[PDB]
């Protein structure tokens, strides 16, 4: 997702926070 989530939430579509990195399909893309 190329997105970090230091405050606990991801905003990129389909991405979820695995503090402190956003993941999609289980990977930080």
Curated annotation (Swiss-Prot):
The keyword Disulfide bond appears for this protein: yes
SUPFAM superfamilies recorded: Cyclotides
Keyword vocabulary terms for this entry: Disulfide bond, Knottin, Plant defense
Keyword Disulfide bond: yes
Cystine pairings recorded for this chain: 1-15, 5-17, 10-22
InterPro entries according to UniProt: Cyclotide (IPR005535), Cyclotide_moebius_CS (IPR012324), Cyclotide_sf (IPR036146)
A biological process from GO: defense response
Domain of life assignment: Eukaryota
PTM annotation, UniProt: This is a cyclic peptide.
Positions bearing the Cyclopeptide (Gly-Asn) cross-link: 26-25
Family: Belongs to the cyclotide family. Moebius subfamily.
Domain characteristics, as noted in the entry: The presence of a 'disulfide through disulfide knot' structurally defines this protein as a knottin.
Stated role: Probably participates in a plant defense mechanism. Has cytotoxic activity against a variety of drug-resistant and drug-sensitive human tumor cell lines.
Protein name, UniProt field: Varv peptide F
Species for this entry: Viola arvensis
Organism classification: Eukaryota, Viridiplantae, Streptophyta, Embryophyta, Tracheophyta
